[PDB]
Amino acid sequence: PNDDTEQALDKILRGTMRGGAALIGSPRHHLTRQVILTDLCQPNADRAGTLLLALRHPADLPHLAHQRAPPGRQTERLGEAWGQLMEATALGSGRAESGCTRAGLVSFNFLVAACAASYDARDAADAVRAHVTANYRGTRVGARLDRFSECLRAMVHTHVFPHEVMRFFGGLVSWVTQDELASVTAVCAGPQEAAHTGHPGRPRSAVILPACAFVDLDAELGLGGPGAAFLYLVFTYRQRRDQELCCVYVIKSQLPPRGLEPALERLFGRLRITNTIHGTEDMTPPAPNRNPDFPLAGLAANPQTPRCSAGQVTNPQFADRLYRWQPDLRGRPTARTCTYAAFAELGMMPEDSPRCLHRTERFGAVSVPVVILEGVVWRPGEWRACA
Amino acid sequence: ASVTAVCAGPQEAAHTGHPGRPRSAVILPACAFVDLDAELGLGGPGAAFLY
Amino acid sequence: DGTGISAHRQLRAIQQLARNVQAVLGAFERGTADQMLHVLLEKAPPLALLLPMQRYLDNGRLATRVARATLVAELKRSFCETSFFLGKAGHRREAVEAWLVDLTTATQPSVAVPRLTHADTRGRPVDGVLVTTAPIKQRLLQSFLKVEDTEADVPVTYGEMVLNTLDELESAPQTTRVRADLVSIGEKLIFLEALEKRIYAATNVPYP
Amino acid sequence: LLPMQRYLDNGRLATRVARATLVAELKRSFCETSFFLGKAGHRREAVEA
Amino acid sequence: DLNRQTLDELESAPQTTRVRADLVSIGEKLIFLEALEKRIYAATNVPYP
Amino acid sequence: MLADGFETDIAIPSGISRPDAAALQRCEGRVVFLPTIRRQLTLADVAHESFVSGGVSPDTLGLLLAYRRRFPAVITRVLPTRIVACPLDVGLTHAGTVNLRNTSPVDLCNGDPISLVPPVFEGQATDVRLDSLDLTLRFPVPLPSPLAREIVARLVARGIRDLNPPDLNVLYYNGSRLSLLADVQQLGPVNAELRSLVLNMVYSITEGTTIILTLIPRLFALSAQDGYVNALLQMQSVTREAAQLIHPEAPALMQDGERRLPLYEALVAWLTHAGQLGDTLALAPVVRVCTFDGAAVVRSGDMAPVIRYP
Amino acid sequence: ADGFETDIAIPSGISRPDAAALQRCEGRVVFLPTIRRQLTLADVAHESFVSGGVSPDTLGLLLAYRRRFPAVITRVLPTRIVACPLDVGLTHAGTVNLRNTSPVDLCNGDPISLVPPVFEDVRLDSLDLTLRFPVPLPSPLAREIVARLVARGIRDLPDLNVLYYNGSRLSLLALGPVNAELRSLVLNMVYSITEGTTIILTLIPRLFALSAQDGYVNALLQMQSVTREAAQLIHPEGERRLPLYEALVAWLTHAGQLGDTLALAPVVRVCTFDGAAVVRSGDMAPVIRYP
Amino acid sequence: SPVALHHQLKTGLHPGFGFTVVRQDRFVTENVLFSERASEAYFLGQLQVARHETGGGVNFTLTQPRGNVDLGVGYTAVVATATVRNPVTDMGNLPQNFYLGRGAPPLLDNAAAVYLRNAVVAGNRLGPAQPVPVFGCAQVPRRAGMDHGQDAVCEFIATPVSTDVNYFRRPCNPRGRAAGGVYAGDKEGDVTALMYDHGQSDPSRAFAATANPWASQRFSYGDLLYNGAYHLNGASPVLSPCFKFFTSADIAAKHRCLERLIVETGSAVSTATAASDVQFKRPPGCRELVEDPCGLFQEAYPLTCASDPALLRSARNGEAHARETHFAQYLVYDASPLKGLAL
Amino acid sequence: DHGQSDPSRAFAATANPWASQRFSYGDLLYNGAYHLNGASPVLSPCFKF
Amino acid sequence: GLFQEAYPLTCASDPALLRSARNGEAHARETHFAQYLVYDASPLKGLAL
Amino acid sequence: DVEFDALLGSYCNTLSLVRFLELGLSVACVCTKFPELAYMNEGRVQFEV
Amino acid sequence: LELHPAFDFFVGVADVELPGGDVPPAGPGEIQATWRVVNGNLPLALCPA
């Protein structure tokens, strides 16, 4: 019986000392830092383990709408909307600081309360908007909500889409505070659970999400069973001359990024039909009954139809002898105006059964319905339009 | 091929040629072996005549 | 474990190194004898382009527009005569012997002298090395030539250099007898081995 | 045989052209050395190889 | 150690006798020579293979 | 990807005829479709019997949509009790390399992406059977990525003939002549392929495209002068015979043409739908080849080092 | 350790001005045939990309960089060039400095693809070879900047030069040989799109002929729908036959060829840590690949 | 006309026209080395140990740097060639198709330009199976079986009818003029002076200026097909033995000292590849050390050839008894290093 | 396959058009399958061919 | 069996034109106005036969 | 009944350890050892003629 | 389509008892076999002038 005690004693003592690289890189992990204004992010309010989204340094914006808009819509609607938002900051309205203080990040809980009127659970959504107005460090916060939601309405109408402008930035782990600016530390790639908090009293944290945007396609598809799940960031678009819509969702699903498109069609296909019908105003039609069909199937049969050789063409002696065909396209609702919900690769859960909770926390003293995720490993990806 | 067969006497008592596996038995497929002890209902011991 | 099965498994495991170790640590001395042929083949010119060139440089350069170009006819003519020899004119003991002397006389004695000269049993040191294929060696021994003393003296110590930026070699004589082949051609003893059974036997490597 | 032993050392992977050389190098070697002693005997140096 | 004593070389050399037969030197090695007409296949029905 | 990676385990049922056990040890490197990324599954889940649809046996063209709904994984090592495999959509190993044995008629080159095709070709149709467990195993054929886009294009164009009451069978690559075995195609999945085409077909047509259509007389004049332009038309395109008859011309003038760029907007919409469509029919080329001891050709029937492709 | 490092040997005969330019080119993107420990510099140079006879154009450099393998040069010894490949060597280390040859600044969290030097040069005298380094510019601009230069070439048969990223001007025009270097990419665009927009127009003989804005949407929606009614909404059903179904396959392969070319996948993402978020021109940027 | 000359070559009629035939062959030969005592100094290093974790395993790659010093002043080593094993290339007949070439512009009418391309490719051996891709290299169809070796690629060059056949009975150029850089003196334009200056006669043929008027001059029909700069091949993976002759940029960059130029054909990079099915251009990573007598001298060797099959049979008696001429027919007996060989 | 040439005669496609093609007159006399012989106990030397 | 080939014999279509072959091959004519000769290519060539 | 399988013998090769100086091709070079070669950048040898 | 020396093989019109109307419709067609009658009905490539 002594050799069984020796084999147990040997394996444990060998198991600690023979550990390679002294257990430094046993979790693979990465870290980011960036110094950004506390305008649209409140890391004091939004605690460690929330989503962050970066901007495009908004000087690009007001003429990209001049360049990429469909004809008939307004161009300066985006620039007039954005200038009122920088007015509502009342700190950096002077534009004189260049190169620094971008206010580049947007906290996820702020973006929920901007698009909050389009959700379903209004009682849950208004509780999110409460501590946005209450728990944030600033005055007239609801004025910023009304401008920035109008800006997102002005994003889709002036057709510079927010998913081309928004981009994933890593989740919060720690923040160092000062007036008007905070040193933000985040985790771009790797597991969320490996990130050292800095507080020895409270070790490793997790991902915190409001329950308004969290959607599980395990329920409405009826698909049970264990397995790994792919977290996603999904917007919603509704294009009309009316004031337009926006939503953000975080969808937990077993489906691949290559196969998400019929699933988002099953949810948001009602919104998909609308932006095909509407969203074409004012885009003027051509004159009615102008367009002919193709004689290409017809003229290819008869050898007596006049042709052209390579030496003939680009001469007007044969340009009149050939068939003349003038297509028109000014009344076409084409897919860039048929746009709707768009997604991106966000991260995966390597658990056998993915762990989700539904708790309420403060955010003193606002109690918010919150979904808590566990063991999130981050892999960002490209955006993808479902149009 | 060369064939050694038993024309008369017991099927057992002929030597196989492998002393590792001696004397053999009759192998027949079950599609052809049909008794008349069942289809005449006559049990009881005794000897039988293969046909 | 403490079991006899687990302790026997290391004998399969440790000897799996020692077969692979002694193959790879033997694969580098053959790695010399590969490149040893490759460097010489990159340096050595063929015969039919040398036999006029030795007779040219003995006159000197005399670099003219004219007498330089007399090589080109004497390269072309001497190419199409003696590019191939043994399939062209075999079965003749006279013409082959001068052709073998043409191997020995087309190269100049080259600097510098070694300290550890490859000596023979009771013989003068070896002055050159032939390298032939396997079937040619059978022809060159049953005909046209004689075998001599199979044992010779070879230095075993590799040369050692130690940085002190100017540094000099240290060499020590430790001679051993080696089974080999010695051929007397002309005025100097010539070495002759084939390198099929010793090196390149049962590999994927072409014979250069 | 005598063409195969000139083959199987170099290029164990049968490159398709060098495989095709082995067919013709059977034939030319066959039609010479199928039979030997009735073909060209009475030549001592020729037989001893 | 690699490589150790083989099982086959552990045996003693067996006792030998003297046999009259023809031995021919070819190349480097002695080649044993026989023709089998008298000893085997004489006055049988088996053709000489 | 984890620090150790993620390795699923496919358990083997205990009833095994010993010749079927040696048949599994020849499956050292193959590609296995998992339905989930569950850690423990069975061979019945992997095999062709669960891989059928409800009541209906899928054909070759309908088997492509069944692939992209599932997870391709590669067997690493065959154990006596179970089979250990690594998924491809999940980060594949600790080291980043897998061996893949070619059950493919065509050799591989370095750097080329690998997509994978059902057993389609004649003669080499090889499916491993586990007759003790009464199972059938149809394993996919790894192929280079422009070849897989040909074979999908040959199958889909064959089904469009079936809706219209010659010929399209023969492919070529590295000079090899090879055809493919197919008898029928179910009318269900062809409509799923065709609707995936024509929606992506339409979404390339924007206002700038009609301006590009005015350059059709320029190309047919330019193919006279340079043989590189003659390398386009190939006599089998529509546009050579379309240029011989139709002389189109531009519309004028475009609405709000000062603020916008119509030729630029037609290209970007074209790059996201028509140039995307090589991904939409088959599955993605997740894997390319990086030999380490540099072998320019990976021969048919041999393993190869394997590294992900973005 | 266990970090992988390719070793590129320089052939001797370097003049003192030639080694100074190679001393300066520390963080740049360099392609190579196969992942291997030791390798000559002849496979690195631009001369190694040729097919003839012909120095390769912008189209071939896009095709080569799929088959070639990207690597970033580490510290440069006078003996050898030590570079690590991106796709295998970085998965253990995690952080590699990278200097921009791009005039466009880099924000934090950006995905970066590689572009051949078409936007707009090192040659060695003593070693008789040239070096061309690709441009590490961000991937959303990469689909734009390529498509702007294609749009100029269609005009060869408003301003396209305006590209304003993160508060900065760009001038695409800056001229002569840039246009003819890009000519082969232009012709494969127009031949792909016009062959696209004839076959769809032959299978649907009345796309353009259909009525505007309301019947076309009704034709769109039923085609856009998921329901089983699919084939009867599409097809129109001696004399020569239009070889349409063969022209399907040749167009799909040519469209399938250009999907690998113009994806411009995000090989590199930059995570700025302990420093400024904006990384400007001529500055080393840290690189973290996907885990 | 390129359409019209199709008709007359099918019905057997000889147009006013001539040819040369150029093809390249590869022989596997045994060799003999010799080297006097200290022919080279050799330095070997101390080996390194390395580690590389892949695919469920650990690679140890043992590497070691080793160096070479040629101590001899002068030639210290000789390659001696010996008996031939194999004519690895078959001495067959292949017409090179420029329809793989894709460089030259076609004629205008697509009724006519396709009519040739069907009637030349089908059913030729070397013709493309699927028509040529837009950028890439076209492919030659896989032959189902191989007979003797890889089939060499014959080539055809327009030549006059009235050259003396005596120019071909001895070794010469397919080009009508000689080439450098062995024949050139010491002046900046000497290489191109041998190429295209026709006030002066040829070196190797001082009797006249050229041998082919349709080759060996600037922008000749012989050159513009086969000039390395002008790129009428390169999409074709099939070899071109004329490329080693007619590319003027290759000779102009040659080393010119005969102290060194002998050694370069002791080991030269071939343009051909062995494991390739037919002759193909070399892949960029494989280089075979091949002796090239055709490399330096810029000549090629005529074979035993005749036009009567009857008058060809006089050659197998021997050299002397072969009659050469009979009224229109003619014989060319070989001048080659393989002259008295059994091959 | 007569779109392809022969191996041994790469000059042309056949030597006999009445052999070496499916359903030739050379085929149906002496194939193993089509069986005009065999009940003849006499040999057919091109049965091997 | 291996090669799938066959060997020609010494044969001609005139009996008198055959008589040039018994001298040896090197002076035997093959052709004459319409007739012909085929000299053999066989492994039995240099035998007594 | 009594049945059994059997193993008969186990045979191996012996890899011949080949010192390079066992060859006499090493006459052709003076092979001396650097402990360091990879750190050297200048490889010139002075010749006095 | 050249398989038997006493028969011509060629492509004909499908499903027609002949004769036979004025213009037969273009069907897929099959190979119809007819009897070569005389020696002159052989193609002149195989029986030259």
PDB file of C-alpha atoms in Angstrom, chain B residues 15-39:
ATOM      1  CA  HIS B  15      -8.921 -39.237 -39.225  1.00  0.00           C
ATOM      2  CA  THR B  16      -8.935 -35.603 -40.340  1.00  0.00           C
ATOM      3  CA  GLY B  17      -5.227 -35.077 -40.979  1.00  0.00           C
ATOM      4  CA  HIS B  18      -5.005 -32.306 -38.415  1.00  0.00           C
ATOM      5  CA  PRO B  19      -4.310 -33.867 -35.001  1.00  0.00           C
ATOM      6  CA  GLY B  20      -4.948 -30.364 -33.698  1.00  0.00           C
ATOM      7  CA  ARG B  21      -8.567 -30.676 -34.818  1.00  0.00           C
ATOM      8  CA  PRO B  22      -9.550 -34.358 -35.013  1.00  0.00           C
ATOM      9  CA  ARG B  23     -12.786 -36.123 -35.982  1.00  0.00           C
ATOM     10  CA  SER B  24     -15.568 -34.188 -37.733  1.00  0.00           C
ATOM     11  CA  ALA B  25     -19.373 -34.035 -37.822  1.00  0.00           C
ATOM     12  CA  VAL B  26     -22.079 -33.576 -40.426  1.00  0.00           C
ATOM     13  CA  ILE B  27     -22.872 -30.001 -41.454  1.00  0.00           C
ATOM     14  CA  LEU B  28     -26.131 -29.340 -43.297  1.00  0.00           C
ATOM     15  CA  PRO B  29     -28.053 -26.134 -44.006  1.00  0.00           C
ATOM     16  CA  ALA B  30     -31.326 -25.734 -42.141  1.00  0.00           C
ATOM     17  CA  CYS B  31     -33.353 -25.203 -45.333  1.00  0.00           C
ATOM     18  CA  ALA B  32     -33.236 -28.904 -46.235  1.00  0.00           C
ATOM     19  CA  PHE B  33     -33.216 -30.756 -42.910  1.00  0.00           C
ATOM     20  CA  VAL B  34     -36.868 -31.645 -42.376  1.00  0.00           C
ATOM     21  CA  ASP B  35     -37.928 -34.237 -39.825  1.00  0.00           C
ATOM     22  CA  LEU B  36     -40.951 -36.457 -40.060  1.00  0.00           C
ATOM     23  CA  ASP B  37     -41.062 -36.870 -36.286  1.00  0.00           C
ATOM     24  CA  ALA B  38     -42.850 -33.510 -36.069  1.00  0.00           C
ATOM     25  CA  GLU B  39     -45.146 -33.805 -39.086  1.00  0.00           C
TER      26      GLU B  39
END
